[PDB]
Amino acid sequence: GGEAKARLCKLCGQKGHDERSCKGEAKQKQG
Ligand SMILES: [Zn+2]
């Protein structure tokens, strides 16, 4: 069941949530 317009997570690749809501804030630093 599901009456909502939303595609699978682009970072998790699962059904239920999305990348926009997924925590996509990683530390991008050289070291
Ligand atoms: Zn995700």
| Strands (E) located in 1-31 | none
Distance 30 CA to ligand 1 centre (A): 25
DSSP-derived letter for residue 4 is S
What CA–CA distance (Å, rounded) separates 31 from 14? 32
What CA–CA distance (Å, rounded) separates 11 from 25? 11
3, 23, 2, 1: which is closest to 11 by C-alpha?
23
Experimental method: NMR
Distance 21 CA to ligand 1 centre (A): 8
What CA–CA distance (Å, rounded) separates 11 from 30? 22
> Which amino acid is present at 27?
K
Distance 29 CA to ligand 1 centre (A): 22
3-11 long-range Cβ contacts below 8 angstroms, 24+ apart: none
* Residue appearing with tokens 């949530």: 17
